[PDB]
């Protein structure tokens, strides 16, 4: 039933604003936390409990923490329109940033702020009765997101143990880039994701920019558009816990179906009816059309081409007016295609979900209103190509000890670079070996 | 002669809701539970499925089991949900995770004692107990693991009674779950030792029935579960109404099962016909027999034309002649003689019941024991060996605690079942 | 940017309450509330 969200740094807080805006409008909580209880047609329901708790006077408050080292972005959340929704203790801010240094976040500064965050997370987990996971939002390109993300994940593993932690992570795009030191921070985050995370979904802004230019008609997109798309994806995946449906799917079923071996937990994500209002009324949007859409690489939210690999498992979430017979006919047609290939040890490659609640429309949004949508998360060997380009860029800079002074002076041994680079190299070899056909049988 | 029902998992609870609607409708029980019927013939056998509560009411002898109460709240919220006794809903606090080992070993052992206590309390109240009836899917998590656990416990406590299961099995074309081969193989391994009679239904076969025969524009799970509830309520009709040739679950088992391992059967129901066509053809015994043997009307993906019938049973409902039943079963056996196993002189048992389902003049339900069931097991065993050779998802099951030897034993036992069917397929008189 | 993007639609939502979508989530019923109310009340079990 309940889930707790952890937002880290700038990308995580800005994506959090869009997510909580959507969850409020979907459940019906007003921006001040109240509800017009007297103007109602249906009946009051407990569905909010997954994301909200009531004080008893009827105000709603959300199960989230916002973590940042600079005050400005959290102060922007504190002074905006949703000021009264959040409890002030949940908005935690430090004094100074990690300055794009993973070492500064992990060793020197995050160690001071981390104990307040752990005390707040404990206070949330004590007010729960069926917690089934943590959702974490962060970018691995920046200093505090990487370093404090890694430390918090390490502490959570020891404290909560087996409890699941699902991460949505903005990884450095393959040619669009924002800072020079991105490779070091992304590499040194390898251990945290590899050993302390159950499923990690990777996103690149260059793919969401391509999707918003090609499908939507936006010439000058900004981060609020990307964050609205991410919020829609999260709402689709969590709808299975909150609303009625034909085939429900609990968050443990994703972990059971998508990960064959404990390190192979990185998945690609895509969304089908990204369409503008003027095009939406000129076209039907049947189940088979959106099912065909989710497999085209123009629909993906990560810059990778799955045609360079093999699928191991796919999980398809349908929401809205869909009939199971059409889903079965669509999946059988996809299975017929010759450009889609599965590893021969995975014969039953699909998991299906069908929910009755159609996707919500946000007043200032750019998506059209549609009766049905499908969202897919899939595990594929093509992801090995994404790590190799970061490793090449890391190998280029570390050779000349280009910026090592900052990290070693701020507290890190030079050995840690070689350690992290060899561990990610072994992960690439794992992805090469697991994907090799067992053609030798006798 | 009363049956106790157990419904497990989402599929089981959903099929059960439609079954109890059909049973309550035929005996005239209001959705509040009040008897509102119009003939004593309805009341005289009400005991078979209902217990009597005070001042008119009847309550259904069923146990509902699930690991999260969400489904229980959905079934309690349905249109006939009120009839169920509140104390009969048993639920835990965490899910099966779509994992057989969790459903059998961790949450299974946590809940099973309360279920065995309720099942024994319900069974020992009966004056004479007939078999148990269980509905579940083998591809799921709590249905397969805890259903087979409960079957094992009830077989220990009541070894002289009958154990009957209706089970849903994965389609050959599209999977609903990635780990279906493990759950199916372990469940079939448990059933072949424990069960007395097992009936199998493919959702793909119900879709083909709806689209080809009924030409429905927008089918839903309510239609598939209504077809299943119709056949389920048809099999027991001779137990609870008069007839010229009464029948019973034990008589069906004795005539259908030649050897104890060969107890997996195909199902069909005959008077299926579209609303546009129905005005053009009247019901008669030749029409029911022709649809009844048409493979288009069979609820499994395997086709009889690739196998041979060892035995079959037909239960007829309605006011009808013995000539049409006896002469039709002889004529069908004589014209298609190559499809019947030759070392049994007569493979079909017939039974006739006077009271048809409401709105139909006549109906027949068909149960068939056919060797083509070997193709389903062979397909599941191939997909299992491909996944097991590569340790595809084994760490979940081993982390719950299972020894790898269980997988090799279950594979070997299922492979021997396939071999036994193939050997009886190619037997000869010599 | 956050003002013109999010605060504008927040103010619009404050002015208009007919934009909230209707829904049906009948899976939240009495047994779920019974499990909710009974946290920490485990009694009379044998180990």
């Amino acid at each position: 039933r309940e889930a707790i969200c952890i937002h880290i740094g700038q990308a995580g807080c800005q994506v959090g604003n869009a997510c909580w805006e959507l969850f409020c409008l979907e459940h019906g909580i007003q921006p001040d936390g109240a509800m017009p209880s007297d103007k109602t047609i249906g009946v009051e329901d407990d569905a909010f409990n997954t994301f909200f708790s009531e004080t008893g006077a009827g105000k709603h408050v959300p199960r989230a923490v916002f973590l940042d080292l600079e005050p400005t972005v959290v102060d922007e959340v504190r002074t905006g329109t949703y000021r009264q929704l959040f409890h002030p203790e949940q908005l935690i801010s430090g004094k100074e940033d990690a300055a794009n240094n993973y070492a500064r976040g992990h060793y020197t500064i995050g160690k001071e702020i981390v104990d307040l965050c752990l005390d707040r997370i404990r206070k949330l987990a004590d007010n729960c009765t069926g917690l089934q996971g943590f959702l974490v939002y962060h970018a691995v390109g920046g200093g505090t997101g990487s370093g404090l993300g890694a430390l918090l994940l390490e502490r959570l593993s020891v404290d909560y143990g087996k409890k699941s932690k699902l991460g949505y992570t903005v990884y450095p795009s393959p040619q669009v880039s924002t800072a020079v030191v991105e490779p070091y921070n992304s590499v040194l985050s390898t251990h945290s994701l590899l050993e302390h995370t159950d499923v990690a979904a990777m996103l690149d802004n260059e793919a969401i920019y391509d999707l918003t230019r090609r499908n939507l008609d936006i010439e000058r997109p900004t981060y609020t558009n990307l964050n609205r798309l991410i919020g829609q994806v999260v709402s689709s995946l969590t709808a299975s816990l909150r609303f009625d449906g034909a085939l429900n799917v609990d968050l443990t079923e994703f972990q059971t179906n998508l990960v064959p071996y404990p390190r192979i937990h990185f998945v690609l994500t895509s969304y089908a009816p990204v369409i503008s209002a003027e095009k939406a009324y000129h076209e039907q949007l049947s189940v088979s059309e959106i099912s065909n859409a989710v497999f085209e690489p123009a629909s993906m939210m990560t810059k990778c081409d799955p045609r360079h690999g093999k699928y191991m498992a796919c999980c398809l979430m349908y929401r809205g007016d869909v009939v199971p017979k059409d889903v079965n006919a669509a999946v059988a047609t996809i299975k017929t295609k010759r450009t889609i290939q599965f590893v021969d040890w995975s014969p039953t490659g699909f998991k299906c979900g069908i929910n009755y609640q159609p996707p919500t429309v946000v007043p200032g949004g750019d998506l059209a209103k549609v009766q049905r949508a499908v969202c897919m998360i899939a595990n594929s060997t093509a992801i090995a190509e994404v790590f190799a380009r970061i490793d090449h860029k890391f190998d280029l800079m570390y050779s000349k000890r280009a910026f090592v002074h900052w990290y070693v002076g701020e507290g890190m041994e030079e050995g840690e670079f070689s350690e992290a680079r060899e561990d990610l190299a072994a992960l690439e070899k794992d992805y090469e070996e697991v994907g090799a056909e067992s053609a030798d049988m006798d | 002669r009363e049956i106790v029902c157990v419904q497990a998992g989402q599929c089981g609870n959903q099929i059960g809701s439609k079954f109890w609607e059909v049973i309550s409708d035929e005996h005239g029980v209001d959705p509040t539970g009040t008897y509102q019927g119009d003939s004593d013939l309805q009341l005289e056998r009400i005991n078979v499925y209902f217990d009597e509560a005070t001042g008119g009411r009847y309550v259904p002898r069923s146990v509902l089991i699930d690991l999260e109460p969400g489904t229980m709240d959905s079934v309690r919220a349905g249109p006939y949900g009120q009839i169920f006794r509140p104390d009969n809903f048993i639920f835990g606090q965490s899910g099966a995770g779509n994992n057989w080992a969790k459903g059998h070993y961790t949450e299974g052992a946590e809940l099973i004692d309360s279920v065995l206590d309720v099942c024994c309390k319900e069974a020992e109240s009966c004056d004479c107990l007939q078999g148990f009836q269980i509905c579940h899917s083998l591809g799921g998590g709590t249905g397969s693991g805890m259903g087979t656990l409960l079957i094992s416990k009830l077989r220990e406590q009541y070894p002289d009674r009958i154990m009957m299961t209706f089970s849903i099995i994965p389609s050959p074309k599209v999977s609903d779950t990635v780990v279906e081969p493990y759950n199916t193989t372990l469940s079939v391994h448990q059933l072949v030792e424990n069960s007395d009679e097992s009936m199998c239904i493919d959702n793909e076969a119900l879709y083909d029935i709806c689209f080809r025969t009924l030409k429905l524009t927008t089918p839903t799970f309510g239609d598939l579960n209504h077809l299943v509830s119709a056949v389920v309520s048809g099999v027991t009709c001779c137990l609870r109404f008069p007839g010229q040739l009464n029948s019973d679950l034990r008589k069906l088992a004795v005539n259908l099962v030649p050897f104890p391992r060969l107890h997996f059967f195909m199902m069909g129901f005959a008077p299926l016909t579209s609303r546009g066509s129905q005005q053009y053809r009247g019901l008669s015994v030749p029409e029911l027999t022709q649809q009844m043997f048409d493979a288009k009307n069979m609820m499994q993906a395997a086709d009889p034309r690739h196998g041979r019938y060892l035995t079959a049973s037909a239960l007829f409902r309605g006011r009808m002649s013995t000539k049409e039943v006896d002469e039709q079963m002889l004529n069908v056996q004589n014209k298609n003689s190559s499809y019947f196993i030759e070392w049994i002189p007569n493979n079909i048992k017939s039974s006739v019941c006077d009271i048809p389902p409401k709105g139909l003049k006549m109906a027949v339900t068909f149960i068939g024991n056919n060797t083509c069931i070997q193709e389903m097991f062979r397909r599941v065993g191939e997909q299992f060996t491909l996944m097991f050779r590569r340790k595809a998802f084994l760490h979940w099951y081993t982390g719950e605690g299972m020894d790898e030897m269980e997988f090799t034993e279950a594979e070997s036992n299922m492979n021997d079942l396939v071999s036994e069917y193939q050997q009886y397929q190619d037997a000869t008189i010599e | 940017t956050k003002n013109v993007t999010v605060d504008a639609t927040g103010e619009y939502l404050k002015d208009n309450i007919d934009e909230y979508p209707a829904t049906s989530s009948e899976c939240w019923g009495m047994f779920m509330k019974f499990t909710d109310n009974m946290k920490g009340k485990k009694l009379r079990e044998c180990y």
């Binding site: 109602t40 249906g42 | 239609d223 209504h226 119709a230 | 979508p21």
Partner: peptide
Amino acid sequence: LIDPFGNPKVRDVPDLFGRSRYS
């Protein structure tokens, strides 16, 4: 809305598109 046997039936899937919770 027609049953597989031809009889009329009530709705079984909620109608939500185009609906609003608060009047």
